[PDB]
Every structure is written in structure tokens, then in C-alpha cells.
């Protein structure tokens, strides 16, 4: 399974972790068997002005199951009022860029 | 407050919605001990100290 995250989030790619990546993007099972390999790619995945082609999920109704892949872009309801697909107060776009 | 003289706020007799805090994008650390961060709204406490 290959993907890009920022340095501080590398620790989240492990069993028993929590956080925006562990919970909403890429979840590993507590009984995971395997190896997590990472390297700095600042010379590839960064650009002047900011590289906005790498996204992560910031909001979700619930945590992901192990190896679940959620790629929806539906507006997240933070409040008690239905968003009806329109972002605004208490209605968030679920993804964000690393830049 | 300074860490050597930290400030304790006693919280009681109220409704505690912890999803507002947990689902926030504005915090870099949110680590719960002795309790799941997603079960907090199902629990009742005799007091909360912030």
C-alpha cells in the first residue's frame, strides 16, 4: 500500500495509533503483520509555491476500519443542520491539501 | 498559565460534548487515556478538571 503523508504523520502508520491519518485515511489493524517503510521525498513531492496534489481526509463521521479506503468528497456535517451538499457554517469540505 | 503554575478549571453540572473538540481540525494532539475518544459522549462523570 503506497501513499504520501507529511513527516510528523509517519508515526500514525502503525498498529494502535490515532490521529487524522490513522482514523480517517489509512488504518492498520492491531494484529497487523507486515512492514511500514518510509522515506523523505522532499525532492520529488514538493514544489515552489506548494504542491497541492496530495490530499488527506480531515473530517469523517466515524473512524475507518483496517484497510478501508474512503474516497468520497461529500460535505461533512459538523453541526445539527443538514448541509445539503453546500459547504459553509458547520459544513466542511472533508479533504485538505498538504501544500 | 505557566506550566509550573498551571490553571485548574473545575467542570460540573453540565452537558459535555467532546465531539466538538475531538473532531476539530485545530488540535495537533488529542490523546485519551483510560477511555476511547469516540465513546466520551456515551459516558457520565462525577467531575471534569480542565
Amino acid at each position: 500500500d503506497s501513499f504520501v503523508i507529511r513527516g510528523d504523520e509517519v508515526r500514525q502508520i502503525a498498529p494502535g495509533q490515532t490521529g487524522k491519518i490513522a482514523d480517517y485515511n489509512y488504518k492498520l489493524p492491531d494484529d497487523f503483520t507486515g512492514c511500514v517503510i518510509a522515506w523523505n521525498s522532499n525532492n520529488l513531492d514538493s514544489k515552489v509555491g506548494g504542491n497541492y496534489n496530495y490530499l488527506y481526509r480531515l473530517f469523517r463521521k466515524s473512524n475507518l476500519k483496517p484497510f478501508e479506503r474512503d474516497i468520497s468528497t461529500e460535505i461533512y456535517q459538523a453541526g445539527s443542520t443538514p448541509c445539503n451538499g453546500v459547504e459553509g457554517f458547520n459544513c466542511y469540505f472533508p479533504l485538505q491539501s498538504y501544500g | 498559565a505557566s506550566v509550573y503554575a498551571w490553571n485548574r478549571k473545575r467542570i460540573s453540572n453540565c452537558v459535555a460534548d467532546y465531539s466538538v473538540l475531538y473532531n476539530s481540525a485545530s488540535f495537533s494532539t488529542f490523546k485519551c487515556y483510560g477511555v476511547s475518544p469516540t465513546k466520551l459522549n456515551d459516558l457520565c462523570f462525577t467531575n471534569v478538571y480542565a
Epitope: 506548494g50 497541492y52 480531515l58 473530517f59 468528497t73 459538523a78 453546500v86 459547504e87 459553509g88 457554517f89 458547520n90 459544513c91 466542511y92 469540505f93 479533504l95 485538505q96 491539501s97 498538504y98 501544500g99 | 476539530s24 481540525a25 485545530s26 488540535f27
Partner: antibody, heavy 122, light 104 residues
């Protein structure tokens, strides 16, 4: 944090104008880009905003139906296109940065950075 | 909503204190009230947000306070660069509203 807008424009009534705003010094998609108008001798009027991550927008009822906001994250630039220009649209147009609605400390309630005003004459 | 500032014009000597007022037609959360400074020929800059919090780069000569429908901006000592137009700004109902502005 810098916001750099295009130069002044002169348009005839019925024409459309597109004002750009290039952002730098921050994560472009981490903030909403707002546009604020200031007619000569008048105060500041909020027009609307765009959220570059999705290009979702919201407009003031005053401009809704006439103004379209777009953005391009690859060049961290926001655009505001105001159609059907009238003589009373003569104003200095500013781009301004504010936090997204999910900001815990309500950074969306105000504009912390502004670009240089761009004068549009109609 | 209507945000009404007063006085329309404020005139006093450098080195003295000035108080600028902004009244709301309805209650405004302190978290949603901001003050801006606009020098002639320049874009507005943020001075105060959240009713009382200074923006980064703003001198401690500037302070704000208030709640409900009555907010103020205070300049403890006026410098030549403080003789500009000030605005109050409110957020609510998914909209941003500015006052008419006052000139110092």
C-alpha cells in the same frame, strides 16, 4: 503572507472584469479567499468567498448572480469575475484571507490579510 | 445587521487617547467582532479580532473591548500613523458586514 492582485482595469457598462489575486507564504488551500469592494468615498462591502480546495463558493445577495469566483491551486491564484458591470460598480476590489469555517477559534469571522486594492472603473 | 460607528469624525492631538465606538442593531458575539485600520491609498489591515485580541504586528497601544451591542476600540496614545480610517466588522448569518467607518 502576501497577496498580490492584478493592475487597475477600465471597462464599459455591460462588460465583465476578472481580478486575480496571487497568494504566497502559506498553504493556499488552508484558507478561504474573500473579496471585498470599496466604492469611492464608501466603506468596505463583502462580496463572497471561494474555498480553493473544492472551489466551493458563497456570495452576498447583492452580487449573487453577477459574480463568479474561481481559483487555481497550481499557481495559488484566486479570481473574481464580475459580469454585467454598471457605473455604480466603480470601486477598489480587495482580496483577503480568512480561516475556513472549521477553525476552532473563529478565524473565519475576520480577514487577517489583505492584498493591494485593484481599481476597476466603469 | 447594521453596524453603526461613532463619531463619524474624531479629532484630537497626537499623544492623546482616542475612543472609537461601534454599535450593533442586534447582539454580536465578541468572537465575531473585529476592527480594521485603513490608511489613505492603502488596503485595510486587521487590528483587533475577537473584540479584544490584537493581530500580529499590532502595537500594544491598540486595544479593544465590549460585548453584545456595544464595542469600542481604544488608542492609548496616538501617533501620526494612527490618523486613519477605522472600521468595525461583524460576522453572522454566514455573512460579513462592515460599519461605515470613522476618520481619526
Amino acid at each position: 503572507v502576501q497577496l498580490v492582485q492584478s493592475g487597475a482595469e477600465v471597462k464599459k457598462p455591460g462588460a465583465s472584469v476578472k481580478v486575480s489575486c496571487k497568494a504566497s507564504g502559506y498553504t493556499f488551500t488552508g484558507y478561504y479567499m474573500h473579496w471585498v469592494r470599496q466604492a469611492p468615498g464608501q466603506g468596505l462591502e463583502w462580496m463572497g468567498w471561494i474555498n480553493p480546495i473544492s472551489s466551493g463558493t458563497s456570495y452576498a445577495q447583492t452580487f449573487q448572480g453577477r459574480v463568479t469566483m474561481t481559483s487555481d491551486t497550481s499557481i495559488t491564484t484566486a479570481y473574481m469575475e464580475l459580469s454585467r458591470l454598471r457605473s455604480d460598480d466603480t470601486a477598489v476590489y480587495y482580496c483577503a484571507r480568512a480561516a475556513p469555517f472549521y477553525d476552532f477559534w473563529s478565524g473565519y469571522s475576520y480577514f487577517d490579510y489583505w492584498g493591494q486594492g485593484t481599481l476597476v472603473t466603469v | 445587521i447594521v453596524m453603526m460607528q461613532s463619531p463619524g469624525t474624531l479629532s484630537l492631538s497626537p499623544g492623546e487617547r482616542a475612543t472609537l465606538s461601534c454599535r450593533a442593531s442586534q447582539s454580536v458575539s465578541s468572537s465575531y467582532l473585529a476592527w480594521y485600520q485603513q490608511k489613505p491609498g492603502q488596503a485595510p489591515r486587521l487590528l483587533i479580532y475577537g473584540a479584544s485580541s490584537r493581530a500580529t504586528g499590532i502595537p500594544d497601544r491598540f486595544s479593544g473591548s465590549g460585548s453584545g451591542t456595544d464595542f469600542t476600540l481604544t488608542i492609548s496614545r496616538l501617533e501620526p500613523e494612527d490618523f486613519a480610517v477605522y472600521y468595525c466588522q461583524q460576522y453572522g448569518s454566514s455573512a460579513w458586514t462592515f460599519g461605515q467607518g470613522t476618520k481619526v
